[PDB]
Design an enzyme around this catalytic site. Sequence first.
Site, PDB file in Angstrom:
ATOM      1  N   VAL A  41       0.816  -1.222   0.000  1.00 21.63           N
ATOM      2  CA  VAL A  41       0.000   0.000   0.000  1.00 21.63           C
ATOM      3  C   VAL A  41       0.841   1.260   0.000  1.00 21.63           C
ATOM      4  O   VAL A  41       0.298   2.355  -0.018  1.00 21.63           O
ATOM      5  CB  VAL A  41      -0.975   0.113   1.219  1.00 21.63           C
ATOM      6  N   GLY A  72      10.338   3.343   4.551  1.00 20.50           N
ATOM      7  CA  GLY A  72       9.895   2.005   4.904  1.00 20.50           C
ATOM      8  C   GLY A  72       8.688   1.709   4.032  1.00 20.50           C
ATOM      9  O   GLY A  72       7.911   2.608   3.726  1.00 20.50           O
ATOM     10  N   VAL A 113       5.087  -0.483   3.245  1.00 15.86           N
ATOM     11  CA  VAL A 113       3.983  -1.016   4.028  1.00 15.86           C
ATOM     12  C   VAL A 113       3.099  -1.956   3.199  1.00 15.86           C
ATOM     13  O   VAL A 113       2.819  -1.699   2.026  1.00 15.86           O
ATOM     14  CB  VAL A 113       3.098   0.112   4.634  1.00 15.86           C
ATOM     15  N   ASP A 148       2.685   8.421  11.925  1.00 19.87           N
ATOM     16  CA  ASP A 148       3.440   8.836  10.755  1.00 19.87           C
ATOM     17  C   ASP A 148       2.993   7.974   9.582  1.00 19.87           C
ATOM     18  O   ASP A 148       3.223   6.767   9.557  1.00 19.87           O
ATOM     19  CB  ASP A 148       4.933   8.659  10.978  1.00 19.87           C
TER      20      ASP A 148
HETATM   21  C1  LIG Z   1      11.366   8.164  15.350  1.00 22.10           C
HETATM   22  C2  LIG Z   1      10.190   7.934  14.361  1.00 22.10           C
HETATM   23  C3  LIG Z   1      10.427   7.689  13.012  1.00 22.10           C
HETATM   24  C4  LIG Z   1       9.363   7.503  12.140  1.00 22.10           C
HETATM   25  C5  LIG Z   1       8.052   7.532  12.623  1.00 22.10           C
HETATM   26  C6  LIG Z   1       7.826   7.759  13.986  1.00 22.10           C
HETATM   27  N1  LIG Z   1       6.587   7.801  14.508  1.00 22.10           N
HETATM   28  N2  LIG Z   1       6.240   8.653  15.350  1.00 22.10           N
HETATM   29  C7  LIG Z   1       4.972   8.438  15.662  1.00 22.10           C
HETATM   30  C8  LIG Z   1       4.222   9.305  16.703  1.00 22.10           C
HETATM   31  C9  LIG Z   1       3.922   8.436  17.932  1.00 22.10           C
HETATM   32  C10 LIG Z   1       5.118  10.495  17.131  1.00 22.10           C
HETATM   33  C11 LIG Z   1       2.922   9.821  16.136  1.00 22.10           C
HETATM   34  C12 LIG Z   1       4.520   7.369  14.969  1.00 22.10           C
HETATM   35  C13 LIG Z   1       5.564   6.998  14.185  1.00 22.10           C
HETATM   36  N3  LIG Z   1       5.620   5.908  13.377  1.00 22.10           N
HETATM   37  C14 LIG Z   1       4.603   5.218  12.795  1.00 22.10           C
HETATM   38  O1  LIG Z   1       3.460   5.665  12.673  1.00 22.10           O
HETATM   39  N4  LIG Z   1       4.966   4.045  12.259  1.00 22.10           N
HETATM   40  C15 LIG Z   1       4.249   3.133  11.537  1.00 22.10           C
HETATM   41  C16 LIG Z   1       4.422   1.774  11.858  1.00 22.10           C
HETATM   42  C17 LIG Z   1       3.740   0.767  11.176  1.00 22.10           C
HETATM   43  C18 LIG Z   1       2.881   1.129  10.133  1.00 22.10           C
HETATM   44  C19 LIG Z   1       2.696   2.480   9.800  1.00 22.10           C
HETATM   45  N5  LIG Z   1       1.877   2.823   8.798  1.00 22.10           N
HETATM   46  C20 LIG Z   1       0.606   2.403   8.714  1.00 22.10           C
HETATM   47  N6  LIG Z   1      -0.022   1.924   9.817  1.00 22.10           N
HETATM   48  C21 LIG Z   1      -1.286   1.512   9.744  1.00 22.10           C
HETATM   49  N7  LIG Z   1      -1.967   1.557   8.590  1.00 22.10           N
HETATM   50  C22 LIG Z   1      -1.414   2.003   7.462  1.00 22.10           C
HETATM   51  C23 LIG Z   1      -2.159   2.052   6.278  1.00 22.10           C
HETATM   52  C24 LIG Z   1      -1.548   2.541   5.096  1.00 22.10           C
HETATM   53  C25 LIG Z   1      -0.204   2.986   5.096  1.00 22.10           C
HETATM   54  N8  LIG Z   1       0.365   3.439   3.941  1.00 22.10           N
HETATM   55  C26 LIG Z   1       0.523   2.939   6.302  1.00 22.10           C
HETATM   56  C27 LIG Z   1      -0.079   2.456   7.489  1.00 22.10           C
HETATM   57  C28 LIG Z   1       3.380   3.480  10.494  1.00 22.10           C
HETATM   58  C29 LIG Z   1       8.889   7.968  14.836  1.00 22.10           C
END
Ligand SMILES: Cc1cccc(-n2nc(C(C)(C)C)cc2NC(=O)Nc2cccc(Nc3ncnc4ccc(N)cc34)c2)c1
EC number: 2.7.11.24
Length: 338
Positions: A27, A31, A33, A163
């Site tokens: 999707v 990184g 996904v 994110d």
């Molecule tokens: C140090 C750092 C580096 C990069 C990101 C972060 N980060 N920070 C946060 C906060 C707590 C500050 C809001 C959250 C993240 N990272 C994050 O959200 N990671 C993440 C992990 C697993 C999956 C996803 N993405 C999807 N998940 C759930 N459904 C989808 C549906 C469609 C798509 N395209 C993506 C997804 C995103 C922190």
Amino acid sequence: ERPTFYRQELNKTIWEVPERYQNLSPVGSYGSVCAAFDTKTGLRVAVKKLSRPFQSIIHAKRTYRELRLLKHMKHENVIGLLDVFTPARSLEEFNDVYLVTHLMGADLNNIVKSQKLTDDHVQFLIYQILRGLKYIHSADIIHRDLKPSNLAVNEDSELKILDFGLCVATRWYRAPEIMLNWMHYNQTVDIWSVGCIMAELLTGRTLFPGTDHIDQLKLILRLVGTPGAELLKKISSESARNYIQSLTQMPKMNFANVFIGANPLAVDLLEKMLVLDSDKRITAAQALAHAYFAQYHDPDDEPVADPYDQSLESRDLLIDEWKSLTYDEVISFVPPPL
Ligand SMILES: Cc1cccc(-n2nc(C(C)(C)C)cc2NC(=O)Nc2cccc(Nc3ncnc4ccc(N)cc34)c2)c1
Ligand SMILES: CCCCCCCCO[C@@H]1O[C@H](CO)[C@@H](O)[C@H](O)[C@H]1O
Ligand SMILES: CCCCCCCCO[C@@H]1O[C@H](CO)[C@@H](O)[C@H](O)[C@H]1O
């Protein structure tokens, strides 16, 4: 108790995951996904495979930081970690990291494009952003890219902050001090972003639709007014000051006249978010107690982060030191309750 992994190629990327994860469907692609199906739970999840996580120092640190952060994010309005895995049996072969979350559908952008929001809807959406931000900010983390496309909103208007990679320009929601390259940032930069989003849910249009950062700045000053003497003086560059000085001196707009059909309480909150001086913006904690949210405000259910230290930007380590710390966190991971 190590699960059985299976291997697969998708979009020139190898994916090796536990068998419990089925129907991987790309999707988005640092990184990439896949939407997947967790056979164990029957749930739709997202699996993120981090790109070359220990192949640069920048990547190694970011990798550790995202994992350690998300392992500790356990809040209704912030993305949580369902699982983390690597196909490595040892640190010596540890080259890949996969993170699993609940799969998100629509974002806030899908909402504001699909419908005109009633004030109550705006209340609930904004309340939830601030409650999540209060929690994120208490861990001493700044989001830095709070915009509608980073805000998941489920079918019953439950909002989660995350994110979203690149699954709406960032610069429209950016505090002015970031686009001026101010070296040190307040968490207050995120509150600027909430003001921009709140305005857009109230009116249906982008508050500051800049075509570039200079346009972006001009549009901002048009609404809030050009800075006064003491703000000007905090800008150390003479050329920057001179350019700012050179703009036609804009008065501060009256937000009540601008947002003429909005709840006067939404307008008051807006005034407290979109203040030029970052020290003077309302905090998320303070915002939550604002009268605009008296319908949703509960000081016994607006929690803050656990005690783990997540303040890492200052930290300088060796590339293999970030990998080994990351490995420890993968190993010590314990999946949440249902
Ligand atoms: C140090 C750092 C580096 C990069 C990101 C972060 N980060 N920070 C946060 C906060 C707590 C500050 C809001 C959250 C993240 N990272 C994050 O959200 N990671 C993440 C992990 C697993 C999956 C996803 N993405 C999807 N998940 C759930 N459904 C989808 C549906 C469609 C798509 N395209 C993506 C997804 C995103 C922190
Ligand atoms: C924090 C310091 C801000 C100073 C930035 C000044 C740059 C704006 O000067 C530039 O003017 C050009 C005219 O040649 C235009 O193409 C653009 O609108 C603008 O980027
Ligand atoms: C184009 C003119 C925009 C004015 C930008 C002023 C932004 C003021 O916000 C500033 O943020 C800094 C970073 O957190 C803090 O150190 C300052 O004390 C604070 O005043």
